């Protein structure tokens, strides 16, 4: 008489890439290796506005110009992972015997898993930080239609 282990299953996590969601359709992604040095970013617009000449005596506004400045806004993302001290140690040591080998790849699997969790949870941050930037700048519809 026995008892049977029918199955063992592990949830598999699919990678999520920002550049492959349709949220990025509203964004233009440029990479900047050393953004950590930039103090401030800036974009400056210059616009010149035409007029209509009229027969009427009323004074006509002269040539007009408009200059608008925009600035960069920085965002920061942080994540924390914890690892056993027993686990990091056996990474260094070579496996002496078969049980010490199986216990070894069990350590490299765990350390690797933690790293995947760290880098993955960084992609969720891009998707959220972008999505939050919009909802911060999205005025409601009932205000917008009249104003358009």
């Amino acid at each position: 008489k026995f008892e049977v282990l029918l199955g063992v299953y592990t949830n598999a996590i699919q990678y999520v890439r920002f550049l492959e969601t349709a949220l990025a359709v509203s964004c233009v992604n440029t990479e900047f290796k050393d953004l950590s040095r930039m103090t401030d970013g800036k974009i400056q617009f210059r616009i010149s506005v035409p007029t209509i000449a009229h027969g009427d005596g009323r004074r006509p506004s002269k040539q007009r110009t408009f200059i608008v400045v925009k600035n960069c806004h920085k965002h920061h993302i942080s994540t924390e992972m914890e690892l056993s001290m027993l686990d990091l140690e056996i990474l260094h040591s070579i496996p002496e015997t078969p049980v010490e080998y199986a216990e070894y790849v069990g350590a490299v699997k765990t350390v690797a898993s933690a790293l995947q969790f760290g880098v993955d949870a960084l992609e969720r941050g891009l998707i959220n930080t972008v999505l939050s930037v919009k909802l911060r700048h999205a005025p409601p519809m009932f205000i917008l239609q009249t104003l358009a």
């Binding site: 008489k1 049977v4 080998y101």
Partner: protein, 50 residues
């Protein structure tokens, strides 16, 4: 919808206690599905990921 038909299997999937599972059943009284699979993943390709 003029379908009224579905393709299915015509026979059950079988489970049998073989020599590896059988030895464990006698000695320890514990049986694990696909001892073949557990051994393939533990003793044969440990390096390989899932």
């Amino acid at each position: 919808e003029a379908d009224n038909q579905i393709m299915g299997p015509s026979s059950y999937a079988s489970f049998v206690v073989r020599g590896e599972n059988l030895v464990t059943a006698v000695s320890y009284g514990r049986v694990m599905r696909t001892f073949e699979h557990f051994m393939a993943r533990i003793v044969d390709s440990p390096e390989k990921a899932g």
